[PDB]
Amino acid sequence: TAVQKLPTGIEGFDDISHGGLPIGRSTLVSGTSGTGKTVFSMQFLYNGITHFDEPGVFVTFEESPQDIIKNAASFGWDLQKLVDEGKLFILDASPDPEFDLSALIERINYAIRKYKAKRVAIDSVTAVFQQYDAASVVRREIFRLVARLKQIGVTTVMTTERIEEYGPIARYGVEEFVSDNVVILRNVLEGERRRRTVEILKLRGTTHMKGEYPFTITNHGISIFPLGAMRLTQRSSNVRVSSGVPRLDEMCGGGFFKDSIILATGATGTGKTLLVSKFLENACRNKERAILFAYEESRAQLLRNATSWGIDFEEMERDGLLKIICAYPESTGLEDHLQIIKSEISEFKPSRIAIDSLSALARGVSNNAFRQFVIGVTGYAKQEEITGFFTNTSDQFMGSHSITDSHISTITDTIILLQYVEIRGEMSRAINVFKMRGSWHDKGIREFVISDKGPEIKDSFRNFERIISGSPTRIT
Amino acid sequence: VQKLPTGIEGFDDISHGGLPIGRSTLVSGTSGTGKTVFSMQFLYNGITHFDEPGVFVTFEESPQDIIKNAASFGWDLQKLVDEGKLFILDASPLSALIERINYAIRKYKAKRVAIDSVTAVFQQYDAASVVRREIFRLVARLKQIGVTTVMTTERIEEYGPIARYGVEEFVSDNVVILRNVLEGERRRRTVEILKLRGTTHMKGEYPFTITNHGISIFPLGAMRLTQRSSNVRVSSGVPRLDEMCGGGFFKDSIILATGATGTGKTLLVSKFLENACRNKERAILFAYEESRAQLLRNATSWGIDFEEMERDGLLKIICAYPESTGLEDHLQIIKSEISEFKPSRIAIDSLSALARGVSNNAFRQFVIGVTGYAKQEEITGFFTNTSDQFMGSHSITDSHISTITDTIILLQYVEIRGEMSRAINVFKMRGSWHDKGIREFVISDKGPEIKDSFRNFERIISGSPTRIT
Amino acid sequence: AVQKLPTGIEGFDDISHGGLPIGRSTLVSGTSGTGKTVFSMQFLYNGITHFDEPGVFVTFEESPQDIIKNAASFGWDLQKLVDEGKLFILDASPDPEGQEVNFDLSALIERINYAIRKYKAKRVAIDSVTAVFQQYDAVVRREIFRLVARLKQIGVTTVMTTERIEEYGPIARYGVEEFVSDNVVILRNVLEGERRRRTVEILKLRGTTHMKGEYPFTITNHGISIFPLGAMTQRSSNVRVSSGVPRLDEMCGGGFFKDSIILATGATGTGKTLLVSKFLENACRNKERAILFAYEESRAQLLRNATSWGIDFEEMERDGLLKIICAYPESTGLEDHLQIIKSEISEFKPSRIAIDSLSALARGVSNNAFRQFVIGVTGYAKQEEITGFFTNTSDQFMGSHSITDSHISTITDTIILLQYVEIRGEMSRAINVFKMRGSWHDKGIREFVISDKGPEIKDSFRNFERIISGSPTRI
Ligand SMILES: Nc1ncnc2c1ncn2[C@@H]1O[C@H](COP(=O)(O)OP(=O)(O)NP(=O)(O)O)[C@@H](O)[C@H]1O
Ligand SMILES: Nc1ncnc2c1ncn2[C@@H]1O[C@H](COP(=O)(O)OP(=O)(O)NP(=O)(O)O)[C@@H](O)[C@H]1O
Ligand SMILES: Nc1ncnc2c1ncn2[C@@H]1O[C@H](COP(=O)(O)OP(=O)(O)NP(=O)(O)O)[C@@H](O)[C@H]1O
Ligand SMILES: Nc1ncnc2c1ncn2[C@@H]1O[C@H](COP(=O)(O)OP(=O)(O)NP(=O)(O)O)[C@@H](O)[C@H]1O
Ligand SMILES: Nc1ncnc2c1ncn2[C@@H]1O[C@H](COP(=O)(O)OP(=O)(O)NP(=O)(O)O)[C@@H](O)[C@H]1O
Ligand SMILES: [Mg+2]
Ligand SMILES: [Mg+2]
Ligand SMILES: [Mg+2]
Ligand SMILES: [Mg+2]
Ligand SMILES: [Mg+2]
Ligand SMILES: [Mg+2]
C-alpha cells in the first residue's frame, strides 16, 4: 500500500517522477513568470481527458476561462470541445473587475462531483492570498485546501509564484512544507540566453529523479528531455556505410559503421565541410535520406562551395534525399536546437545526419550545457539508427594538440584528424583516422589535396618527423 | 492569439509578429531604459502606418513635455493631436481613471493605448495586495473595452525583480524587460520578452539602441543564415595576391587579414579600397587605430592617395576610438553609414581594437552582426586583426571569428640571417583554389611585392626558421 | 526640441552633448565626497562669470558662510557675487532649537520663487533634497514632483543634489527621485584595491542625446574636470627628428617622425632609458624644450646615470630646455597623473616628451584604466604635435619571447625592440626597429653595446638562428 502514481502524459515528466504524480495527492508547481506553470497544469488535465478519459477541473483566480482557451489553441488543444463535452470545467474564481478559503473548497467539491473529476488544477494559489489580503494564514489555508482535496481523493496541481530562480521555492516560504510534492519550473538567464529547467524537489512516500532537467515549450506543450534517464542501450552492428571518399573508406577498414558517431576535428579550412558534403552525397546516391544541419554557412554558400567540389545538393533536394537546415547558433538555445533536430528527423526520417559544426553551437554556452547537447544528439541517433557525422574546428591552427571538450572525444566512435603541415614553405594538409572503435583503421598520417573533384588522399609523410607539430623536419 | 505590428525595428521579429491584440503588455525597466519611447513609438506607428488612433495616459510627465521630448525622434505628435488621432490623457496630480480612458478610447475610436507610469499611480500607500487587485482591474477593463495596451513599470535593479512589488508580472498577460546594464564603465541596452501568454516569442536578451529614429533592435538570432553567394571575383589591389587567391577575393565574402603589428594589414586594406575607387566602387573605411591624417600620409608613402578618392566621392574614412561608444552603438554606426553611402566594399581596421575592453560573447555578437549585414547587403568586407604574439603565430583571431570568415590572409615575421623578413600566406579561401605557399613579401614606396616561398627553410611558422641541411 | 545650457564644467558639455536641458531639473546623486556640492556651485559660478546668468543656491544644512568659504579653495569669491546680487544663498537650515510637526514643500517653493524673480536667476541649485525629508519623514515622490513642476513653470534650469549609500546600487535613497526627475547624473567615488576613482555618468537626458557610461573626473583648484576619451584629429607630417643616436636614425629611415609615438620595449636593463636620454639630449641640442616624466628613478639617479653615459641633464635643466618631473605611480591615480602631464605640458610648451615608464604606471591598476591613460597621453601628444618616446619593460628576461602585454602596439607608431642574446656564454644586447609607420626601416636585429659615450649599434647576427628566443644557435 505504497504511494501509487498517475501518468501526467508530459514527455519526460513520468520518467523523472518514476511513474508520474502521486495519486490522490497535491503537487506544488512553483516558478517565476513565463516558466510554464499554466501550460503544465493544463497539459496535466488535457492529457488526462484525451489519453486516460479522466475529467478535470481548472480553478482560475485571475485569467478568464475564455482567455485560458485561446492561449491553449497554440498547442492545438480544443478546450472548448472538452468543455462542451463536460470533460473539462473551468471554475472562474477571478475577482470582478468592477476571510479563509472555504466557500471555494465547496465549489470545487461540487464541481468535482458534477463532472466526475479525477484531476484538478489550481492556478494560482498565491493570487487569492494577495488578491484578498491574507499573507498571514497562508499555511493554514493551503493546508485546508490540500486536506479537503485529499478527502475528495483527487490528484491536484497547485501553481505557486516565485521572484528568484535559485532563491526561495515559493513566495511566503511556507507553501513547500505543507505540500506533499514540490516541482520547480525555472527559466534561468545565462549570459543573455534563457534555459527552461524542471526539478522534482520532493515526492513524499516515493522515489524520483533528483536535479534539474532541461525542457522546452513547443506547439505540443512541455517536452522534458530526460538526459539522465536516457539509458546506454543501443543495437550496434558491423554493417558499414561509405564516406563518399573511397580511400578514406579503405582507411576506415571498409567504411564507417552504420551505428556510429563520426567526428572530423581540424583547424579552419582543413576540409571538414567537404568530408560532410561527400558523406551526404553518398547517402543520396545509395538512395538514402539525409539532413544537413548547418550553423556556419548559408544554403547559397554551401551550394556554391559544393558545386566547386562537384556536388549538386539541389538535385538531391529535388530528388527528396537531402534537407539542408540552416540556422545561426544564437537563433535559439541548445535545448531548442536539439528539439528542432529531433523534430526535423522524425518528419524526414533520415538514415544519415550531419551537424556543421559542434564548435559553432558551443559559442558562449557553458561546457556543461554543451555536454548535455552532444550526449542528447549522440544518444538520439544511435537509438534511432541514424549515422552521424559531426564537425569541430580546433582553435590551434597548426597541427593538432587536443580537444576542447573531453566529452566529445569519448562520445565519438570514429575520429578523423585533419591538420596542416608546413612542407618546403607550403601549407600542406594531412588526414588521419585517429580512432574507429571496432575496426582496423589506417594508422597513417596521409597527405591530401583538395581539388575541383574533391579530396585526393595521397601517401604518408614517411620521410618526415614531428608532423603532429605542424612544422616537421625531413630526416635523410 | 493574433498580434499587432508595433513597427519597432526588430521587435516584431523578436515577438514573432508583434504584441497580442486586445491584451496588455507590461514594459518594465530602470530609468533611462526607454520605456516612454517604446510606448510613444508603439502609438506613433499605430497612426502613421496602420491608421490606428492611440491614447497616452500620463501620470507625471506633462503632455507638452511628451511632445517636446518626442520631437527629437522627428514625431509631430501635436499635428496628430490636432487632427484628433492622438489623445494624451493627463492623470498628473482606478475606476474613475478607467472610466476616463474608456471615454477617450471611444471619443477617438482608439485601438492602441499607452499607460505610463502605473507604478506612480500606486505611489501613495497601495501595497502588494492593492497593486495586484488594481492592476488586475486595469488590465481586465482594458481587455473588455477591446484595446491593445502597453503598460510601463519601474525597477530598482537590472538583474533583480522584474517590477517593484513583485506582483505586476504575474497579473500581466505579456511581459517585456528593458535593461541598461553598466558593464564596467559602459552601458548596454537590451530587450527581453519574458512572457507572451498564448503564443511564441524569441527568448533571451537582445541588444537595442535609442537613435534619432527611436528604439532600434538588431536581433542576432532572427538574423537568418540565408545570404546569397556568387562566383564573382573582386581584386585585392595586389595582383600576385589575386593570383594566390585563384583570381581574387569573392564579391560575396568576408576577408580576414591576421598578423602581428607592422606586418602590413593596413597596407592590404589600403590597396583593397584603392582597387575599389579605381573601379568607381564606393567604399568605407571604419578605422579604430589611426587617424585620417596619418592614414593619408602613410598611404602616400605607399603610393596611394585617399584624398582624391574621397573627393571623387568613392571613399569614406570614418575614424573613432573603440572606447568612445559601446559595440552595440558601433554596429548601428556601421549599418547607418552603409545605408547612406551605399558602399560595395567595406573595411574595419581593426577588429582587435574593438575587442579591447569587451566580452568575447559581445564581440562575437558584433562580428556576427557586421559579417551578416555585409553578406546580406552584398558588401565585401576586409577585416583586420592584430595578434598579440609577434612571431609565435600560434592562433588567428583567437575567438572563433575564423569560422565566420571566408578568406584568411596570414601575415607573419620570419627571422632570416639576423634580419626580420615578412611573409604572406592565403590560409583559407572557401570555394577557390588558393596558393598554399608561405611567400616572402617586401613593402616599399610602391607597396607590397610578393616574392617566392621559403623552400630551403623549416619551422617557418615558428617565426624562427632553420635552413635545411 | 530640447535645448541645453553650457555648464562650463570641463568635459560635461561633451558627455551631455551640449549641456543640461534648459527649463528642466537635473538630479545629481552620489555618495559622500563625490563632488555634488562642487558641481552645483560650479554650475552657478560659471553661469554668472561666463554667461551673466544669476543663480540661487538652496541649502538645508551648511551655512552660506561655509559654502562661500569652501568655494575659496577653487578661487571663487562668492561673497563678491553675493554682494553684487549676482548670487543668493537661501538658507533653509533647521532652526538650532525647535520641534518637529504630512510634509509640504509649498513654503520653500515660494521662497525660491521669490528669490528667483528677485535676483532674476536663470540657474538654481538644491542641495541636498534628501536632507529635507531626512529631517522629518518620507511624500518624497509628490513633493519632488511639486518642486520640479513649479521650477519648470518658472523656467529655471535646476540642479537637485541627492545622496546615495552604495556606489553601484540604488541611484538615490528612496527609489523615486530618479523616475520623477527628467535628467539623472550619477557621481561615483569607487574604491578599487585601496585607491578611489571619481567617475561621472549621465544616466538619462529625456528628449535628448548624451554619452552613455562612466567617465573619469578629478576635483582640483579649477573644480570638477571630466576627461571623455570619446570626445577626442591628430595631424601627421613627414618631418623627421633625431633619436640622439645617428645609427638608429638611419635604421628609422632618417630619424623618428616629429608627429609620432615611439615605443621602446625590452627586458630590464636592455637600455630603454639610454635611448630616452639621447632622445631628449637631441631636443636640447637643437634648442628645443623637453619634459621627462619619470616613475621609476629619482632626478639624482637619472642625472648620475646620464652623466655616466656622457649626458649632462643639469646644463639643459639650467638652460631651460629640460624639465625632469619625478614621481611614484602610486602617489596618485592615472586620472590625476594625466592631468599633471597635460598641465606641465601647457606650462613649458615642449617639443618632445617622454614617459619612463608606462610599465610602471600599469602597476596595480585596471587594464581598462591604463588603456584610457595611454589613449589620452598619446592622443594629447599627437594633438599638440609633440613627439613622444615611451618606455615599456617586459617581465620576460630573455629575448622577445612574447610581445607587449597591454595592447599598446596599435597606438605606438614606431616600436624599438631591445632584447638580450646569449652569445658564447655571454649576455649580449640587440636593437631592432620592429615597426615604423610611414618609412622604410632596417629590418635587422643589430648588436648594440652600451659604453661611457652611450649606445653603439653594430652589425647583425647573420651567422645565428633563433635570435628572438634569446638563446641562438650558430649556423
Ligand atoms: N505554442 C507555443 N510555442 C512555444 N512557446 C509557447 C507556446 N505557447 C506558450 N509558450 C510559452 O509559454 C509561456 C506561457 O507559459 P505560462 O504557463 O503561461 O507561464 P506562467 O509560469 O503560468 N506565467 P505567470 O502566470 O505569469 O506566472 C509563453 O510566454 C511562451 O514563452
Ligand atoms: N574549388 C576548390 N578547389 C580547391 N581547393 C578548394 C576548393 N574549394 C575549397 N578548397 C579548399 O578547401 C578549403 C575549405 O574547405 P572546407 O570544407 O570549407 O573546410 P572547413 O574546415 O569546413 N572550413 P571552416 O568551416 O571555415 O572551418 C579552402 O580553404 C581551400 O583550401
Ligand atoms: N615608405 C615605406 N617604405 C617601406 N616600408 C614601409 C613604408 N611605410 C611603411 N612601411 C612598412 O609598413 C609597416 C607598417 O604597415 P601597416 O600596414 O601599418 O601594418 P599593420 O600590421 O597594419 N600595423 P599596426 O596597425 O601598427 O599593427 C612598417 O613597419 C614598415 O615596415
Ligand atoms: N532623440 C534621441 N536619440 C537618442 N537617444 C534618445 C533620444 N531621446 C531620448 N533618448 C534616450 O532615451 C532616454 C529616455 O528614454 P525614456 O523612455 O524617456 O526613459 P524612461 O526609461 O521612460 N525613464 P523613466 O520614466 O524615468 O523611468 C534618454 O535618457 C536617452 O538615453
Ligand atoms: N658606464 C656604463 N658602461 C657600460 N654599460 C653601462 C654603463 N652604465 C650603464 N650601462 C648599461 O646600461 C644598463 C641600464 O640601461 P637603462 O637605459 O637603464 O635600461 P632600462 O631598460 O631602462 N633598465 P630598467 O629601467 O631597470 O628596466 C645597465 O644594466 C648596463 O648594462
Ligand atoms: Mg500563467
Ligand atoms: Mg566549415
Ligand atoms: Mg518616463
Ligand atoms: Mg594597421
Ligand atoms: Mg554637500
Ligand atoms: Mg629604465
Side-chain angles (χ1 to χ4, degrees), chain A residues 257-268:
Chain A
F257 284 123
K258 186 214 75 207
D259 330 61
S260 64
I261 303 300
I262 322 294
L263 180 67
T265 319
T268 192

PDB file of all heavy atoms in Angstrom, chain A residues 257-268:
ATOM      1  N   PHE A 257      30.888   2.581 -39.746  1.00  0.00           N
ATOM      2  CA  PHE A 257      29.807   1.718 -39.297  1.00  0.00           C
ATOM      3  C   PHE A 257      28.494   2.491 -39.374  1.00  0.00           C
ATOM      4  O   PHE A 257      28.475   3.705 -39.191  1.00  0.00           O
ATOM      5  CB  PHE A 257      30.066   1.197 -37.881  1.00  0.00           C
ATOM      6  CG  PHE A 257      31.091   0.093 -37.785  1.00  0.00           C
ATOM      7  CD1 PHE A 257      32.215   0.232 -36.986  1.00  0.00           C
ATOM      8  CD2 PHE A 257      30.921  -1.095 -38.481  1.00  0.00           C
ATOM      9  CE1 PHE A 257      33.152  -0.786 -36.894  1.00  0.00           C
ATOM     10  CE2 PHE A 257      31.859  -2.112 -38.389  1.00  0.00           C
ATOM     11  CZ  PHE A 257      32.972  -1.956 -37.595  1.00  0.00           C
ATOM     12  N   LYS A 258      27.401   1.774 -39.659  1.00  0.00           N
ATOM     13  CA  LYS A 258      26.081   2.378 -39.754  1.00  0.00           C
ATOM     14  C   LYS A 258      25.685   2.948 -38.393  1.00  0.00           C
ATOM     15  O   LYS A 258      25.150   4.051 -38.312  1.00  0.00           O
ATOM     16  CB  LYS A 258      25.060   1.339 -40.230  1.00  0.00           C
ATOM     17  CG  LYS A 258      23.659   1.870 -40.505  1.00  0.00           C
ATOM     18  CD  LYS A 258      22.572   0.868 -40.177  1.00  0.00           C
ATOM     19  CE  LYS A 258      22.345   0.723 -38.687  1.00  0.00           C
ATOM     20  NZ  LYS A 258      21.820  -0.619 -38.333  1.00  0.00           N
ATOM     21  N   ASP A 259      25.958   2.182 -37.330  1.00  0.00           N
ATOM     22  CA  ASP A 259      25.678   2.612 -35.969  1.00  0.00           C
ATOM     23  C   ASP A 259      26.941   3.263 -35.410  1.00  0.00           C
ATOM     24  O   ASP A 259      27.741   2.599 -34.752  1.00  0.00           O
ATOM     25  CB  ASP A 259      25.233   1.443 -35.082  1.00  0.00           C
ATOM     26  CG  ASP A 259      24.494   0.339 -35.817  1.00  0.00           C
ATOM     27  OD1 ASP A 259      25.099  -0.255 -36.729  1.00  0.00           O
ATOM     28  OD2 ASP A 259      23.327   0.072 -35.463  1.00  0.00           O
ATOM     29  N   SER A 260      27.126   4.557 -35.692  1.00  0.00           N
ATOM     30  CA  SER A 260      28.370   5.224 -35.341  1.00  0.00           C
ATOM     31  C   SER A 260      28.185   6.735 -35.240  1.00  0.00           C
ATOM     32  O   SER A 260      27.277   7.309 -35.841  1.00  0.00           O
ATOM     33  CB  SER A 260      29.452   4.887 -36.332  1.00  0.00           C
ATOM     34  OG  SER A 260      29.121   5.380 -37.620  1.00  0.00           O
ATOM     35  N   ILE A 261      29.082   7.350 -34.460  1.00  0.00           N
ATOM     36  CA  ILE A 261      29.240   8.791 -34.385  1.00  0.00           C
ATOM     37  C   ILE A 261      30.627   9.123 -34.930  1.00  0.00           C
ATOM     38  O   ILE A 261      31.625   8.632 -34.406  1.00  0.00           O
ATOM     39  CB  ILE A 261      29.054   9.279 -32.933  1.00  0.00           C
ATOM     40  CG1 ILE A 261      27.689   8.876 -32.360  1.00  0.00           C
ATOM     41  CG2 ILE A 261      29.295  10.776 -32.824  1.00  0.00           C
ATOM     42  CD1 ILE A 261      26.503   9.415 -33.129  1.00  0.00           C
ATOM     43  N   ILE A 262      30.673   9.935 -35.993  1.00  0.00           N
ATOM     44  CA  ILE A 262      31.923  10.287 -36.651  1.00  0.00           C
ATOM     45  C   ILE A 262      32.248  11.741 -36.321  1.00  0.00           C
ATOM     46  O   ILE A 262      31.363  12.594 -36.364  1.00  0.00           O
ATOM     47  CB  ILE A 262      31.843  10.069 -38.178  1.00  0.00           C
ATOM     48  CG1 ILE A 262      31.048   8.816 -38.566  1.00  0.00           C
ATOM     49  CG2 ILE A 262      33.236  10.064 -38.791  1.00  0.00           C
ATOM     50  CD1 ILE A 262      31.683   7.515 -38.134  1.00  0.00           C
ATOM     51  N   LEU A 263      33.521  12.011 -36.003  1.00  0.00           N
ATOM     52  CA  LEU A 263      33.982  13.364 -35.733  1.00  0.00           C
ATOM     53  C   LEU A 263      35.140  13.703 -36.668  1.00  0.00           C
ATOM     54  O   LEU A 263      36.066  12.911 -36.828  1.00  0.00           O
ATOM     55  CB  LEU A 263      34.408  13.473 -34.265  1.00  0.00           C
ATOM     56  CG  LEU A 263      34.923  14.844 -33.824  1.00  0.00           C
ATOM     57  CD1 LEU A 263      33.811  15.883 -33.855  1.00  0.00           C
ATOM     58  CD2 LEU A 263      35.542  14.767 -32.436  1.00  0.00           C
ATOM     59  N   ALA A 264      35.063  14.892 -37.279  1.00  0.00           N
ATOM     60  CA  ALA A 264      36.155  15.449 -38.063  1.00  0.00           C
ATOM     61  C   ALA A 264      36.681  16.694 -37.355  1.00  0.00           C
ATOM     62  O   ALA A 264      36.044  17.742 -37.398  1.00  0.00           O
ATOM     63  CB  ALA A 264      35.680  15.766 -39.460  1.00  0.00           C
ATOM     64  N   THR A 265      37.834  16.554 -36.687  1.00  0.00           N
ATOM     65  CA  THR A 265      38.450  17.652 -35.959  1.00  0.00           C
ATOM     66  C   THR A 265      39.615  18.203 -36.775  1.00  0.00           C
ATOM     67  O   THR A 265      40.409  17.439 -37.320  1.00  0.00           O
ATOM     68  CB  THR A 265      38.926  17.207 -34.570  1.00  0.00           C
ATOM     69  OG1 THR A 265      37.939  16.351 -33.994  1.00  0.00           O
ATOM     70  CG2 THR A 265      39.186  18.371 -33.639  1.00  0.00           C
ATOM     71  N   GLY A 266      39.710  19.535 -36.845  1.00  0.00           N
ATOM     72  CA  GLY A 266      40.792  20.196 -37.558  1.00  0.00           C
ATOM     73  C   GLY A 266      40.639  21.714 -37.544  1.00  0.00           C
ATOM     74  O   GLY A 266      39.578  22.232 -37.206  1.00  0.00           O
ATOM     75  N   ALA A 267      41.714  22.414 -37.929  1.00  0.00           N
ATOM     76  CA  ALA A 267      41.727  23.868 -37.975  1.00  0.00           C
ATOM     77  C   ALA A 267      40.777  24.365 -39.063  1.00  0.00           C
ATOM     78  O   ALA A 267      40.126  23.567 -39.734  1.00  0.00           O
ATOM     79  CB  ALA A 267      43.137  24.355 -38.209  1.00  0.00           C
ATOM     80  N   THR A 268      40.705  25.691 -39.227  1.00  0.00           N
ATOM     81  CA  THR A 268      39.833  26.295 -40.222  1.00  0.00           C
ATOM     82  C   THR A 268      40.422  26.064 -41.613  1.00  0.00           C
ATOM     83  O   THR A 268      41.612  26.277 -41.834  1.00  0.00           O
ATOM     84  CB  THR A 268      39.583  27.779 -39.912  1.00  0.00           C
ATOM     85  OG1 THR A 268      38.519  28.230 -40.750  1.00  0.00           O
ATOM     86  CG2 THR A 268      40.797  28.659 -40.114  1.00  0.00           C
TER      87      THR A 268
END
